[PDB]
Amino acid sequence: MEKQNIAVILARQNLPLKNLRKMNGISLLGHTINAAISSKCFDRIIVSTDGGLIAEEAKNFGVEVVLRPAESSISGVIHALETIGSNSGTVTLLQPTSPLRTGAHIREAFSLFDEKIKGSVVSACPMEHHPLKTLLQINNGEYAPMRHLSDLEQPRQQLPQAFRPNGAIYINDTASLIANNCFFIAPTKLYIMSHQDSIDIDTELDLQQAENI
Amino acid sequence: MEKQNIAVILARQNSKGLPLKNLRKMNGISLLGHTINAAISSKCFDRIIVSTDGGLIAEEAKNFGVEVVLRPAASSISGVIHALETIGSNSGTVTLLQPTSPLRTGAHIREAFSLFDEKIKGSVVSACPMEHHPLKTLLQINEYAPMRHLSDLEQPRQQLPQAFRPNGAIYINDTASLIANNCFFIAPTKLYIMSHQDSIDIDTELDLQQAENILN
């Protein structure tokens, strides 16, 4: 079992036919497949779907397809890895819903992965509102500061830089992903992307916004 | 001295960013006016003070029949403290009401007030739900660390506590406490939940049109 760098693009059929909606003539799926290919980072690029329309689009792009029976992201990735029978090397989840995430973004993200430490590399963007400046509802009558009550009045500039995964990229050691059964594996490093490039396609406005960009 | 319920509206005239924002009209009434109206209608205050450094803001304030304190040409706390000292009140309650939250009404204030406890005297702060969950984040610790658990990063919305953030519209506090603590967030801070629309904060032209559109 020689190590292989695998890319997994989960793309379901059922936005109607969201993954096939086109942006400048290329489907959302095709855009992500193109980033994977151009990134030159993968030995194998697999598209896991549940519909021939997606599978057909995947094959047209010269990539492998893993069809899924009847029916969770980690389950899709685990399945895809078992289907191709890979349990060693790296595995990257690239969701079609991040059209602005390019081959270049992938290379930069991958260049941060540490083969020896094996922590996750997750693309993320800056948080408009700082997460320490929030409170959690215990119940209808109690809300606890995220951390210290004093933080709510601290300048964000004076607070730890905070980021949120944007969903475009999740790079992991394959053995560690299979073992922990999750995409975030300590020590996690983040690949920072602009909010513009982190656009998550969900509605029509999104498809309009991303294209314009 | 006798306890007093004070509303302090901090409104500078030369607004950094959107110029003369407080005097900026939103559907006929100035932004300052909307907040003063909320303060008036609330029927919760004994005194309503607009703190400012502009004669035009002061003029608008007086036209709505409220008090004015002129400030010299952690800065919010100092402004409220200055207003309190100016009217000579160090007892009762003090509420900061920013004119940048034109959709926070008198009813919102009234509702916010019913949560304040006179014994424990903790703060009452209006807040709105957070779009991106604060537990699904990481902070640079120079490495990156999860807000709480890495597992949290992979949790669906409704499997995490609901999160909220102060929206800036209301901050209610016991007066002696605010003065002793020199801050707005005090012990047993309770939140008064408001919707996103009602929480809109006016900082840009777009916000302005957005706030108007919402009222229309």
Swiss-Prot record, chain A:
It catalyses: an N-acylneuraminate + CTP = a CMP-N-acyl-beta-neuraminate + diphosphate. The keyword Protein biosynthesis does not apply. One of its GO terms (cellular component) is cytoplasm. InterPro entries: CMP-NeuNAc_synthase (IPR050793), Cytidylyl_trans (IPR003329), Nucleotide-diphossugar_trans (IPR029044). GO terms for molecular function: N-acylneuraminate cytidylyltransferase activity. Keywords: Cytoplasm, Nucleotidyltransferase, Transferase. It is found in: Cytoplasm. Its EC number is 2.7.7.43. Its main location: cytoplasm. It is an enzyme of class 2 (transferase). It comes from the Bacteria. It holds the Pfam family CTP_transf_3. Belongs to the CMP-NeuNAc synthase family. This is N-acylneuraminate cytidylyltransferase. It comes from Neisseria meningitidis. The lineage of its organism: Bacteria, Pseudomonadati, Pseudomonadota, Betaproteobacteria, Neisseriales.
